[PDB]
Amino acid sequence: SMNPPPPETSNPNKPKRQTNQLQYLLRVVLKTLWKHQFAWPFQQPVDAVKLNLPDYYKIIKTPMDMGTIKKRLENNYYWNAQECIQDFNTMFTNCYIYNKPGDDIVLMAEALEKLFLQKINELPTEE
Numbered sequence: 001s002m003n004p005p006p007p008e009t010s011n012p013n014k015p016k017r018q019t020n021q022l023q024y025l026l027r028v029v030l031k032t033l034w035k036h037q038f039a040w041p042f043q044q045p046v047d048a049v050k051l052n053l054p055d056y057y058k059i060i061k062t063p064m065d066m067g068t069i070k071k072r073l074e075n076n077y078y079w080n081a082q083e084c085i086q087d088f089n090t091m092f093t094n095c096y097i098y099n100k101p102g103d104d105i106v107l108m109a110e111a112l113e114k115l116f117l118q119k120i121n122e123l124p125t126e127e
């Protein structure tokens with residue numbers, strides 16, 4: 001079985017918090033990206049078996065995807081907004097590292113990242 005286990009989306013020992021910034025990340029940022037027409041390759045872990053990408057998890061050792069991020073937010077997995085922002089950045093970076101510049105999947109990622117940065121520029125202050 002050559003896919004790794006997916007990133008965890010819950011952990012009984014990891015402290016849980018809700019902040020208005022994490023609420024914004026779920027309700028505005030994730031929602032906007034999730035429903036975007038380019039989102040679908042990013043909505044679940046890369047299935048390197050089904051996609052016939054045998055080298056994927058030889059190259060990418062910190063996988064991340066919006067399905068995992070969405071569940072982490074829904075599960076209050078994150079303590080702060082930076083943890084979630086880091087996961088989005090990891091997802092984009094992995095795409096830019098594994099694929100060739102100018103590939104369609106890279107252009108899709110770049111479009112999602114542009115929207116992402118726009119929404120993060122508008123992050124609300126903590127209540």
Ligand SMILES: COc1nc2c(Nc3ccccc3C(C)(C)C)c(C(=O)O)cnc2cc1-c1c(C)noc1C
Nearest residue numbers: 040041042046047051053056094095096098099104105
């Ligand atoms: C090419 O990069 C991906 N492609 C798919 C994918 N199929 C797809 C999508 C667009 C263009 C080309 C393809 C191939 C069929 C050639 C793989 C699918 C799918 O068809 O279900 C799902 N998830 C992906 C994640 C990724 C991906 C992401 C996201 N980051 O790195 C990789 C690799």
